[PDB]
mmCIF file of all heavy atoms in Angstrom:
data_model
loop_
_atom_site.group_PDB
_atom_site.id
_atom_site.type_symbol
_atom_site.label_atom_id
_atom_site.label_comp_id
_atom_site.label_asym_id
_atom_site.label_seq_id
_atom_site.Cartn_x
_atom_site.Cartn_y
_atom_site.Cartn_z
ATOM 1 N N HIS B 103 91.496 98.071 98.208
ATOM 2 C CA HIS B 103 90.716 99.032 97.479
ATOM 3 C C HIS B 103 90.030 100.049 98.357
ATOM 4 O O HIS B 103 89.201 100.834 97.846
ATOM 5 C CB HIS B 103 89.719 98.332 96.531
ATOM 6 C CG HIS B 103 90.271 97.295 95.612
ATOM 7 N ND1 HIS B 103 91.207 97.639 94.662
ATOM 8 C CD2 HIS B 103 90.099 95.968 95.565
ATOM 9 C CE1 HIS B 103 91.601 96.569 94.081
ATOM 10 N NE2 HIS B 103 90.981 95.519 94.550
ATOM 11 N N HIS B 104 90.403 100.085 99.607
ATOM 12 C CA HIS B 104 89.723 101.007 100.591
ATOM 13 C C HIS B 104 90.781 101.864 101.280
ATOM 14 O O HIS B 104 90.500 102.472 102.297
ATOM 15 C CB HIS B 104 88.941 100.167 101.605
ATOM 16 C CG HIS B 104 87.918 99.344 101.035
ATOM 17 N ND1 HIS B 104 86.817 99.858 100.262
ATOM 18 C CD2 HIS B 104 87.760 97.968 100.875
ATOM 19 C CE1 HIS B 104 86.145 98.872 99.741
ATOM 20 N NE2 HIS B 104 86.647 97.727 100.158
ATOM 21 N N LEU B 105 91.976 101.973 100.736
ATOM 22 C CA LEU B 105 93.075 102.744 101.279
ATOM 23 C C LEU B 105 93.346 103.911 100.335
ATOM 24 O O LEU B 105 93.519 103.759 99.153
ATOM 25 C CB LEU B 105 94.353 101.912 101.536
ATOM 26 C CG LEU B 105 94.272 100.955 102.734
ATOM 27 C CD1 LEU B 105 95.457 99.986 102.615
ATOM 28 C CD2 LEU B 105 94.284 101.745 103.996
ATOM 29 N N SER B 106 93.523 105.091 100.966
ATOM 30 C CA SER B 106 93.829 106.318 100.201
ATOM 31 C C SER B 106 95.264 106.197 99.669
ATOM 32 O O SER B 106 96.062 105.474 100.176
ATOM 33 C CB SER B 106 93.704 107.542 101.075
ATOM 34 O OG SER B 106 94.758 107.489 102.139
ATOM 35 N N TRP B 107 95.612 106.970 98.674
ATOM 36 C CA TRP B 107 96.972 106.953 98.157
ATOM 37 C C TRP B 107 97.946 107.412 99.242
ATOM 38 O O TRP B 107 99.047 107.002 99.345
ATOM 39 C CB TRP B 107 97.080 107.849 96.902
ATOM 40 C CG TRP B 107 97.083 107.031 95.601
ATOM 41 C CD1 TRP B 107 96.093 106.999 94.660
ATOM 42 C CD2 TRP B 107 98.091 106.075 95.158
ATOM 43 N NE1 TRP B 107 96.429 106.210 93.675
ATOM 44 C CE2 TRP B 107 97.666 105.584 93.963
ATOM 45 C CE3 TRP B 107 99.267 105.674 95.781
ATOM 46 C CZ2 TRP B 107 98.365 104.649 93.236
ATOM 47 C CZ3 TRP B 107 100.052 104.704 94.988
ATOM 48 C CH2 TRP B 107 99.556 104.247 93.819
ATOM 49 N N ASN B 108 97.448 108.339 100.038
ATOM 50 C CA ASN B 108 98.292 108.833 101.160
ATOM 51 C C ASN B 108 98.697 107.676 102.044
ATOM 52 O O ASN B 108 99.872 107.560 102.428
ATOM 53 C CB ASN B 108 97.535 109.910 101.918
ATOM 54 C CG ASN B 108 98.372 110.611 102.951
ATOM 55 O OD1 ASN B 108 99.592 110.768 102.742
ATOM 56 N ND2 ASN B 108 97.784 111.113 103.998
ATOM 57 N N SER B 109 97.755 106.836 102.417
ATOM 58 C CA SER B 109 98.045 105.703 103.287
ATOM 59 C C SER B 109 98.965 104.753 102.552
ATOM 60 O O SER B 109 99.955 104.259 103.169
ATOM 61 C CB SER B 109 96.774 104.984 103.672
ATOM 62 O OG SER B 109 96.153 105.643 104.795
ATOM 63 N N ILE B 110 98.786 104.524 101.260
ATOM 64 C CA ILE B 110 99.607 103.613 100.537
ATOM 65 C C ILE B 110 101.037 104.100 100.529
ATOM 66 O O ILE B 110 101.950 103.335 100.811
ATOM 67 C CB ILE B 110 99.071 103.375 99.120
ATOM 68 C CG1 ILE B 110 97.732 102.648 99.039
ATOM 69 C CG2 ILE B 110 100.151 102.643 98.282
ATOM 70 C CD1 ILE B 110 97.800 101.263 99.684
ATOM 71 N N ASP B 111 101.245 105.409 100.242
ATOM 72 C CA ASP B 111 102.566 105.936 100.210
ATOM 73 C C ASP B 111 103.240 105.885 101.561
ATOM 74 O O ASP B 111 104.465 105.581 101.669
ATOM 75 C CB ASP B 111 102.613 107.362 99.666
ATOM 76 C CG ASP B 111 102.267 107.428 98.166
ATOM 77 O OD1 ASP B 111 102.512 106.374 97.488
ATOM 78 O OD2 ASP B 111 101.768 108.474 97.688
ATOM 79 N N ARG B 112 102.532 106.186 102.645
ATOM 80 C CA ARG B 112 103.134 106.043 103.964
ATOM 81 C C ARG B 112 103.446 104.585 104.275
ATOM 82 O O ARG B 112 104.469 104.390 105.060
ATOM 83 C CB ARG B 112 102.243 106.711 105.028
ATOM 84 C CG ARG B 112 102.058 108.219 104.915
ATOM 85 C CD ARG B 112 103.423 108.988 104.812
ATOM 86 N NE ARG B 112 103.990 108.768 103.510
ATOM 87 C CZ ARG B 112 104.618 109.698 102.770
ATOM 88 N NH1 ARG B 112 104.816 110.983 103.253
ATOM 89 N NH2 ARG B 112 105.182 109.440 101.633
ATOM 90 N N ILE B 113 102.696 103.673 103.821
ATOM 91 C CA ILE B 113 102.986 102.289 104.092
ATOM 92 C C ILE B 113 104.195 101.913 103.317
ATOM 93 O O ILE B 113 105.038 101.121 103.719
ATOM 94 C CB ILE B 113 101.737 101.388 103.670
ATOM 95 C CG1 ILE B 113 100.616 101.549 104.667
ATOM 96 C CG2 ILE B 113 102.193 99.952 103.555
ATOM 97 C CD1 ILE B 113 99.351 100.834 104.313
ATOM 98 N N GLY B 114 104.377 102.586 102.148
ATOM 99 C CA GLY B 114 105.548 102.328 101.302
ATOM 100 C C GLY B 114 106.794 102.782 102.148
ATOM 101 O O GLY B 114 107.846 102.149 102.142
ATOM 102 N N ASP B 115 106.704 103.955 102.781
ATOM 103 C CA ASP B 115 107.825 104.515 103.516
ATOM 104 C C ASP B 115 108.155 103.581 104.722
ATOM 105 O O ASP B 115 109.269 103.385 105.087
ATOM 106 C CB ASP B 115 107.520 105.889 104.057
ATOM 107 C CG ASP B 115 107.394 106.940 102.915
ATOM 108 O OD1 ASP B 115 108.168 106.803 101.935
ATOM 109 O OD2 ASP B 115 106.579 107.863 103.083
ATOM 110 N N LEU B 116 107.053 102.997 105.256
ATOM 111 C CA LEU B 116 107.276 102.109 106.419
ATOM 112 C C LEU B 116 108.038 100.850 105.950
ATOM 113 O O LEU B 116 108.919 100.363 106.625
ATOM 114 C CB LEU B 116 105.897 101.681 106.921
ATOM 115 C CG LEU B 116 105.835 100.706 108.150
ATOM 116 C CD1 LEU B 116 106.452 101.384 109.406
ATOM 117 C CD2 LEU B 116 104.346 100.407 108.446
#
Side-chain angles (χ1 to χ4, degrees):
Chain B
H103 305 300
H104 303 296
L105 285 168
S106 65
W107 259 112
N108 187 29
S109 280
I110 292 300
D111 291 335
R112 293 308 73 141
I113 285 175
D115 292 325
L116 180 64

